[PDB]
Amino acid sequence: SIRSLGYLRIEATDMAAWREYGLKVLGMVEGKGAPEGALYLRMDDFPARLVVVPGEHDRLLEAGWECANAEGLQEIRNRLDLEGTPYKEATAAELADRRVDEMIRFADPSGNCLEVFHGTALEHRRVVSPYGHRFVTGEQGMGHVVLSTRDDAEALHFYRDVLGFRLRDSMRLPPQMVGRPADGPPAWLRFFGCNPRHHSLAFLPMPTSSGIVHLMVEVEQADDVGLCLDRALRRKVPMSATLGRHVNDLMLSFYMKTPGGFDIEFGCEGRQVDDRDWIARESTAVSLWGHDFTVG
Amino acid sequence: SIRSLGYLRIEATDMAAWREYGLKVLGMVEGKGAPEGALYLRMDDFPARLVVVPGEHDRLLEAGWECANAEGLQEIRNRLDLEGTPYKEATAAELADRRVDEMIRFADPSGNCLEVFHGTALEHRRVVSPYGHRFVTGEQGMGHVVLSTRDDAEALHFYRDVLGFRLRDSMRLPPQMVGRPADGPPAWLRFFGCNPRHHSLAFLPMPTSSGIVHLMVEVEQADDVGLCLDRALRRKVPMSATLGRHVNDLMLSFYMKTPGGFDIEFGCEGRQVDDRDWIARESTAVSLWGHDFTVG
Ligand SMILES: [Fe+2]
Ligand SMILES: [Fe+2]
Incomplete structure (x- = not known):
């Protein structure tokens, strides 16, 4: 805990x-x-x-x-x-x-x-x-949230070393993307686990007006996701990413803007992790396919 | 047979x-x-x-x-x-x-x-x-083809009564859609099976330049479909329908224009039918979700 x-x-x-x-x-x-x-x-x-x-x-x-x-x-x-x-x-x-x-x-x-x-x-x-639809919670909890951080190394220390979350995945961001000069070092988006859900928490070292990058909620079936997309489309909810599957947690999902200005990811088929065998590695792409984040 | x-x-x-x-x-x-x-x-x-x-x-x-x-x-x-x-x-x-x-x-x-x-x-x-990707053929054969017909009743007689295909599903068209008076009789899109694949063949009583409405090929997984859609978008293949799931055969698929001017449906998860149980009915929608043909 x-x-x-x-x-x-x-x-x-x-x-x-x-x-x-x-x-x-x-x-x-x-x-x-x-x-x-x-x-x-x-x-x-x-x-x-x-x-x-x-x-x-x-x-x-x-x-x-x-x-x-x-x-x-x-x-x-x-x-x-x-x-x-x-x-x-x-x-x-x-x-x-x-x-x-x-x-x-x-x-x-x-x-x-x-x-x-x-x-x-x-x-x-x-x-x-x-x-x-039924949401997938149980031992995986509510879903996962990706939040802004001021300093990724500092966040890594507090969440892993202090709080005891596991480091599940890491992705580098070019220095330009994070307001650093083209000549210096990349910054890191890190994903954290507290249970079998691949991640419950991640930190993007880029600012947001809400503090939230995305909130993911998960349903049981791809049809639940596809029906949700249709409801959002009918209601002119602004789209953030097309349907796709993520590399790291294998979530099949689309992203959409909420009334709060941050994205909700509405997904299914999230990968489950066993800490006894999980190897914390660097992922080099966001998605296997789809998830076109230029759609907005 | x-x-x-x-x-x-x-x-x-x-x-x-x-x-x-x-x-x-x-x-x-x-x-x-x-x-x-x-x-x-x-x-x-x-x-x-x-x-x-x-x-x-x-x-x-x-x-x-x-x-x-x-x-x-x-x-x-x-x-x-x-x-x-x-x-x-x-x-x-x-x-x-x-x-x-x-x-x-x-x-x-x-x-x-x-x-x-x-x-x-x-x-x-x-x-x-x-x-x-691996294609799904075997006892299901190559896929399915939806073709034009001049007369749905005569096609029904030939394919079911003469050739021995089973009637698998039917969908109604407004009389005006086939250029009849608006208070004339509906025409019928009929779907025919010869194996467990929900249908191998269907007839749209509307004309097409090629004779082909669509050819469906099936792959094992949704990822195979999602990956193909990305290849097609990259190569500027004309889209005909967004990703969706059909009502009748539960195919999770998208449609795209081929070089022949007819659509290929690139799909997965096609429903299997047992003739001993199957009830031939009328479907009243094309899709459970998605498959927006307005994109084409
Ligand atoms: Fe997510
Ligand atoms: Fe089809």
Whole structure:
């Protein structure tokens, strides 16, 4: 523990657009009990996976990371204490809002905020998408998120050495792409695992207005993906990449712009990894085929 | 009885375009022993599946239909004689050229030419696509071909009642689509099977320049399809339909224009049918998702 991506909390300038998009494009289900004009989007037994709160910005607020139990959370505390990373225990009100038994809050060096928790409540009535797809979560958690970092070496240190994620994959970026002179060194996009899902987390050393590069959610079948593409097309959702399969996690997916300005990857067939045999290597292409990121 | 589609012979106005497309887009392999300036494209142990001969038009010449043995071919002779359909035995030169033991030649009432044969020679050196895909033939044969017909009822009688194909699916057209009065009767696109492949043959009662609406070839995996689409886009092959999944045969495929001006559907995951269970019904949509023919 940490074992998986639990939830994502984001701020939004357009709550109506997010509601229509989560319901009619993503085919998520609305959760009950929210604020004060906030939106809970459900994919499974979790009370909420995507929480959208109204605000003046379109940005990531926090990612919530689930541990197996009190001991698995304490292990994260002990790592943080060894590094000297400041953290706070959740207030009574934060525990009640998130519906978790314990949680700590802290930030990585680039100052992306984390909530690490255990003992979430679940809701048990069947979550049924009107479009007939089922999301793939379980032991792989919510999906995976790719976030901006200020410094890839620093991110590698905090996520692997401090937090204990595994390095799953790495891809180099030419120095020009990251605002470095043509004469100096490439920078690194690194993918991190906490469970069999190839990656739950990755860091792009390039800035974004939201802090999010992409959020991937996974469904069981290619037909689920293709039907989703059709719904997005009908609703004039702006496209970011055509259908394709990734090299590193073998995900078959397309990418589309959300109302928050970052991409959602809507995929299937994500590769599962066993840490006992996985060899961390450098991948040299994004995709095996498709995924034309010029489409936007 | 006829067991599968064996080969397709077409005439072409641009042999160089076909050789490049066959090799670099379809990833078929060139056969040997082709006559003067003809092109043999191979998918498997057949000496050729797609035969392209020089000519003044881009047009279907004949479809070759494989039977299991001499008795299977005689059963077709018997059916033709019962109907009063004229047919000719292949000459010595024709048997040698097609590399078959026996073959009869005749046409349907719309004038489409059939060559029904048994005892093909095979070639045994491995056929290796440079792109790494394997075609799906075997008991399913070469693929399927959708052809023009002048009269759907007469085609239904000839293919089902006379030749013994099974009716596999039907799709209705608005009377006005076939230039009838808008309060006239619908016409019918009918799909015919001779093996587990959902259909080997279908008839659109609408005219085409070549006689061909589409030729489908099948590969093992979605990645093979996705890779082919990238090759085709790179080579500026005209797209006819986006990636999608058909309703009737569940083929996951895209459509593209060949050098002959007709479409090839390049697909995977074709549905298998058992005649003991199969119910012949009317489908009311082309696709579950995708297959936007508006791109062409
Ligand atoms: Fe992803
Ligand atoms: Fe087809």
